[PDB]
Design a protein around this ligand. Structure first.
Ligand SMILES: C[S@@+](CC[C@H](N)C(=O)[O-])C[C@H]1O[C@@H](n2cnc3c(N)ncnc32)[C@H](O)[C@@H]1O
Ligand SMILES: Cc1ccc(C(=O)O)c(NC(=O)Nc2ccc(C(F)(F)F)cc2N)c1
Length: 255
């Protein structure tokens, strides 16, 4: 049994009180106060629509994925990854999201480069034919107390994304990366498309998610086990308040 399974088993034993203190212990987060306040007032400039803009910015600013040309954003939700890419110097952003009951709807914004963005709700990516693009982003993977449900969801995402991969820049969420069948798929995918699995410091401890990014190399099993050990160790000590960082200012204007 994997270190990830032992982490999931321990996470599932936590009381709501314990879970809420564990989930942010020692993580990094952006202060969303100003953005939430502005969004509640219907302000359409500067503010990121979600924590997602800062989450993707973390990989981009480290050259792990370098968005360029036509960007496809799978599971765009409110549009945080889309509006962030829209301001990047290297042309078009197309976001798809399911929407409807229990899902986020795209939020219309006037942040920098809004005019090159089209977000489409009512779209289940599991029924979409692949489109030509220069950057493929995917942030899909719903957490579940069941690791076997999470394993099925992760494989489904990895099988779905592959036909969109054609020597392009990519950043794909891998919800549950520790299950041996997931590792098998990731290893096969890394041999063909390259890239590496990376843990984002903005991820909560309540998810084992890692992202498969195009610009990197490394041992997937080693990176996964290092994350399992990190998350397991964070159950040991009293809550460490999260490291607080500034949220992104996405500005205003057309491109
Ligand atoms: C983690 S959120 C994305 C956050 C986004 N990256 C941002 O920056 O705001 C994942 C989104 O995927 C959507 N989603 C889940 N399953 C989907 C599917 N089958 N097709 C399309 N969208 C889906 C969810 O509704 C949710 O809004
Ligand atoms: C559990 C949860 C948490 C956050 C959200 C969100 O969007 O931050 C969410 N969202 C929703 O439920 N969305 C939703 C609810 C109802 C309808 C409908 F049917 F048309 F009336 C449409 C949508 N898109 C659910």
């Amino acid at each position: 049994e994997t270190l990830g399974e032992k982490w999931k088993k321990k996470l599932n034993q936590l009381s709501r009180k314990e879970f809420d203190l564990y989930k942010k212990s020692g993580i990094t987060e952006v202060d969303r106060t100003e953005a939430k306040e502005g969004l509640k007032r219907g302000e359409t400039t500067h503010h990121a629509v979600s924590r997602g803009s800062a989450k993707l910015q973390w990989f981009v600013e480290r050259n792990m994925v370098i968005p360029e040309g036509r960007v496809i954003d799978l599971g765009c939700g409110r549009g945080g990854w889309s509006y962030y890419c829209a301001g990047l110097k290297k042309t078009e952003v197309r976001g798809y999201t399911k929407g409807g009951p229990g899902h986020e709807e795209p939020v219309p914004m006037s942040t920098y480069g809004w005019n090159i963005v089209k977000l489409m709700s009512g779209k289940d990516v599991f029924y979409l034919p692949p489109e030509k693009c220069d950057t493929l982003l995917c942030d899909i993977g719903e957490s579940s107390p069941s690791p076997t449900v999470e394993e099925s969801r992760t494989i489904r995402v990895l099988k779905m994304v592959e036909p969109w991969l054609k020597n392009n820049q990519f950043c794909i969420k891998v919800l549950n990366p520790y299950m041996p069948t997931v590792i098998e798929h990731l290893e096969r995918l890394q041999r063909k498309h390259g890239g590496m699995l990376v843990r984002n410091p903005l991820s909560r401890n309540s998810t084992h998610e890692m992202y498969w990014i195009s610009n990197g190399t490394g041992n997937i099993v080693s990176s996964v086990n290092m994350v399992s050990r990190l998350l397991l160790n964070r159950f040991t000590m009293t809550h460490r308040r999260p490291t607080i960082e500034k949220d992104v200012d996405l500005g205003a204007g057309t491109r």
